Amino acid sequence: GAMGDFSFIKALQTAQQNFVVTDPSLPDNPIVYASQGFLNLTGYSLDQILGRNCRFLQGPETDPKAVERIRKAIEQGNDMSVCLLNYRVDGTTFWNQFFIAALRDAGGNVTNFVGVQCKVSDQYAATVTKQQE
Amino acid sequence: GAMGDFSFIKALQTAQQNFVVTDPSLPDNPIVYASQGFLNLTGYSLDQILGRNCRFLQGPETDPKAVERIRKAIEQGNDMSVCLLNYRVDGTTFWNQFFIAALRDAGGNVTNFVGVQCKVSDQYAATVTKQQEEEEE
Ligand SMILES: *[C@@]12=NC3=[C]C([C])=C([C])[C]=C3N([C][C]([O])[C]([O])[C]([O])[C]OP([O])([O])=O)C1=NC(=O)[N]C2=O
Ligand SMILES: *[C@@]12=NC3=[C]C([C])=C([C])[C]=C3N([C][C]([O])[C]([O])[C]([O])[C]OP([O])([O])=O)C1=NC(=O)[N]C2=O
């Protein structure tokens, strides 16, 4: 039973609270801050996270074509998105649809990236990957 | 058959988020960084934003009780989820659902705030302010 019973108000607030911030000033664009939401999704504690590129969430069966695409996406310094196979701290798997935006200072330089992460269904993942031509 | 699930909506909802960063170390906690999404939604250019407390988005029909709760949260270094009525640069209004995330330095002082903002519906706003007040009883 799912059809009537969707709580879009909690869903939306949850949406706002799963994120990381990265610092492309630093080498390999590490995560430097992370939300509690992100902790709960991934299962990793802060100490295992900050200082790294969140490509650590990737693993064996992650699509490299997709990874390639999103790195290409981020390269000019702009706002793109992607769905990727991601591994929890316990090795379990989940689809991660996430959206990356650049933060800019008074010089119009990208100081930081912010990324909101959304766990999504196999069905969703099929869809978004099928639409690749 | 009937294809789809909740995660499709969640995905759509997270795609509507945009971001700012403020600096409470500075006077009056001004915006210092912003994403393109924040400019589009509000209508202001980057130049017109950076350096201002983002209360400039507020106006005459903004719930003052809500604004004050925000101020309390900020003073205490707490996170805060809230829906406000904001005004674009052109005068038009919209409901702003946003999450304020406290950020600390190594001394454990608040040095930044991260803001995730979101345009939401009259129905959303209605329901949410309605869910408040009850909470106050
Ligand atoms: C990670 N989300 C995420 C969040 C931000 C703000 C940024 C800038 C990147 C991501 N990534 C992508 C990752 O860091 C990396 O850019 C890609 O792997 C492609 O580049 P490489 O160097 O590996 O070729 C995220 N990747 C994820 O797997 N999950 C996320 O949530
Ligand atoms: C502004 N969003 C927003 C984002 C962050 C990260 C922070 C710290 C604050 C906000 N505000 C609140 C506003 O700046 C101000 O701090 C409050 O009004 C506090 O009370 P006072 O009485 O000092 O004004 C935002 N307010 C909005 O209206 N819209 C935003 O997007």
Numbering used by the authors:
A (entry chain A): 234 to 366
B (entry chain B): 234 to 370
Which passages does the manuscript contain on this structure?
To obtain the structure of a fully light-adapted PtAu1aLOV dimer, we set up crystallization screens of wildtype PtAu1aLOV under continuous blue light illumination and obtained colorless crystals overnight. Their lack of color is indicative of formation of the flavin-C4(a)-cysteinyl adduct. As expected from the MALS measurements, light-activated PtAu1aLOV crystallized as a dimer that features an assembly similar to other N-cap-comprising PAS dimers. The two PtAu1aLOV protomers are related by a 2-fold non-crystallographic symmetry that does not apply to the A´α helices. Analysis of the contact area using the PISA web server revealed a buried surface area (BSA) of 1524 Å2, which is similar to that observed for the VIVID light state dimer (1342 Å2), supporting the observed dimer arrangement as biologically relevant. Superposition of the dark and light state structures not only reveals a variety of light-induced side chain rearrangements, but also a significant change of the position of the A´α helix that is released from the hydrophobic patch on the LOV core, thus exposing the dimerization site. The formation of the covalent Cys287–FMN adduct and the resulting doming of the isoalloxazine ring at position C4a are supported by the Fo-Fc omit map and the 2Fo-Fc map. Additionally, the highly conserved Tyr266 located on strand Bβ shows a light-induced rotation out of the dimer interface, which is prerequisite for LOV dimerization.
LOV domains are a subgroup of the Per-Arnt-Sim (PAS) superfamily that sense blue light using a noncovalently bound flavin cofactor. Photon absorption of the flavin results in formation of a flavin-C4(a)-cysteinyl adduct with a conserved cysteine residue, which initiates a cascade of structural rearrangements within the LOV core that are propagated to the domain boundaries. Here, we present crystal structures of a fully light-adapted LOV dimer as well as of a dark state LOV monomer of PtAu1a.
